[PDB]
Amino acid sequence: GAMGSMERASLIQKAKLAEQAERYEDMAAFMKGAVEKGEELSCEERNLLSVAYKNVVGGQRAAWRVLSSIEQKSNEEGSEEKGPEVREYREKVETELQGVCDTVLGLLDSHLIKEAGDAESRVFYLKMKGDYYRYLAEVATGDDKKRIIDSARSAYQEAMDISKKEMPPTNPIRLGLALNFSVFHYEIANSPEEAISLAKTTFDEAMADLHTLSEDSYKDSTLIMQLLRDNLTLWT
Amino acid sequence: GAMGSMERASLIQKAKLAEQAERYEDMAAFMKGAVEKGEELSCEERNLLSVAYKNVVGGQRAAWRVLSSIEQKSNEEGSEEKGPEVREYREKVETELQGVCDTVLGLLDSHLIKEAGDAESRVFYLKMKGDYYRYLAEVATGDDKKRIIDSARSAYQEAMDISKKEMPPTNPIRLGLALNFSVFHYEIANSPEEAISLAKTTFDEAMADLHTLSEDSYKDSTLIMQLLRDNLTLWT
Amino acid sequence: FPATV
Amino acid sequence: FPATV
Ligand SMILES: *CC(=O)N1CCC2(CC1)CCN(C(=O)[C@]1(Nc3ccc(Cl)cc3)C[C@@H](C)O[C@@H](C)C1)CC2
Ligand SMILES: *CC(=O)N1CCC2(CC1)CCN(C(=O)[C@]1(Nc3ccc(Cl)cc3)C[C@@H](C)O[C@@H](C)C1)CC2
Ligand SMILES: [Mg+2]
Ligand SMILES: [Mg+2]
Ligand SMILES: [Mg+2]
Numbered sequence A, B: 001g002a003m004g005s006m007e008r009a010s011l012i013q014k015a016k017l018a019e020q021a022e023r024y025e026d027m028a029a030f031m032k033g034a035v036e037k038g039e040e041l042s043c044e045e046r047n048l049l050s051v052a053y054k055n056v057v058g059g060q061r062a063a064w065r066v067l068s069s070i071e072q073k074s075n076e077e078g079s080e081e082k083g084p085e086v087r088e089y090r091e092k093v094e095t096e097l098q099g100v101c102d103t104v105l106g107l108l109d110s111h112l113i114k115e116a117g118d119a120e121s122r123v124f125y126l127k128m129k130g131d132y133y134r135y136l137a138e139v140a141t142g143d144d145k146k147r148i149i150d151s152a153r154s155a156y157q158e159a160m161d162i163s164k165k166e167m168p169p170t171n172p173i174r175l176g177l178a179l180n181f182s183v184f185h186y187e188i189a190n191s192p193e194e195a196i197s198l199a200k201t202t203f204d205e206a207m208a209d210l211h212t213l214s215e216d217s218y219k220d221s222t223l224i225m226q227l228l229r230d231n232l233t234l235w236t
Numbered sequence C, D: 001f002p003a004t005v
């Protein structure tokens, strides 16, 4: 790997510089190199890994949606034939997106998840696994679509089971997992009722636990709770 | 070249899709492939080429400035020693930026400029040549800095001479060239008086020629004139 | 699109 | 920074 000769601490330092410079592809490559050193990641390091790939794949998803919409319009009645170029370029972007998702899943499987024993690490990585299978599901149209969807579901479910046992209802990781699993239900699994129920119950249980928190923890939890409320407002 | 097997028209089509998707690296690679077909570029095609590389190098320049500022702060008294990483990563971004500039200059030299005979094409390409030497000058700190600056100046000057002979004072290409050459004087050549004089005279001569224009041409010219005014306001 | 983190 | 096009 191209980062094999760079110190772990230097890779982390440069990931933070890349973040400041909004160079998310570089940030992701540095964090991949850091993971491949083989040591477990601290809380801050897990967050850097997640931020980097979330931003890279987020940009790819936005581009894919623009191209997919143009392609859909091209296949409407009365639309002039323009050749294979729109499909080809949508496929190019799609293949790159799938590559990034496969890279992240590969890091999780080799060997982040198997070494993660604390709830905060294990839930966080399993949430990521669910997220990157969800992004694969967004673009899937073939024979493996059901298995891809099920892989997302299974990862989210394991994360949920641990989070409910081991974390308070206001824990930001538990909240963010629930937010994203609810979106999975709505957008991927054709289960809007499940999405709504999950968001509502998560919000309400968090509300009831806010009284236990410091000012700073309260701010952290309420920020994510607002996103649950925003989605509920969108969906009702 | 990786685009050697793709039709010229397909490369142009995909450049336009990439623009819609805000995929400027892809847009630039498609336009490079189109240039390398060896045919001259139409007005619209020249604009696509320029937009693509302007956006790619613009992002690199923004990142370079963030990193250079951090590096400058690191070399202040009382700043803790943090090792070679900031310099290394600034150098990485710098080298990539220089590579993109060299790529654009290479397309201009092989063989866009030598085949450009009409004022609108030749002035546009010479302006681009000035711009990419200016971006090289922004990061230059060594023995060739003076020659890099002079290469920018020479390209802008040839463009100016043609534009004044062959184009009306409201022509958007003449205006954009003058805007950028004025910035060259202010930021690169340590000549703020020349920058101010050029912006003022360009603005005033354009003002006097607006009466000749259609509504649509008026809108085009006045949009760029406002940028001249904005810079004058910044500088006075 | 809905919010995710 | 100043405006360029
Ligand atoms: C060390 C650790 O476990 N972390 C770092 C802090 C963080 C959880 C992972 C919690 C605070 N935080 C956030 O609230 C935001 N991002 C995420 C939340 C939850 C999850 Cl599972 C993933 C990401 C970032 C913040 C700026 O905006 C809010 C809305 C979400 C960062 C991650
Ligand atoms: C065919 C040709 O010669 N072109 C396409 C149109 C254009 C000149 C090059 C003029 C209109 N235009 C602009 O005004 C903007 N960009 C540039 C202007 C001038 C130059 Cl030399 C380069 C670029 C884009 C517009 C959205 O915003 C204004 C402020 C500048 C595009 C290029
Ligand atoms: Mg070491
Ligand atoms: Mg495909
Ligand atoms: Mg339930």
Ligand SMILES: [Mg+2]
Pocket (backbone or CB within 6 Å): B007, B008
């Ligand atoms: Mg051909």
Ligand SMILES: [Mg+2]
Pocket (backbone or CB within 6 Å): B091, B094, B095
């Ligand atoms: Mg250098």
Ligand SMILES: [Mg+2]
Pocket (backbone or CB within 6 Å): none
């Ligand atoms: Mg003069």
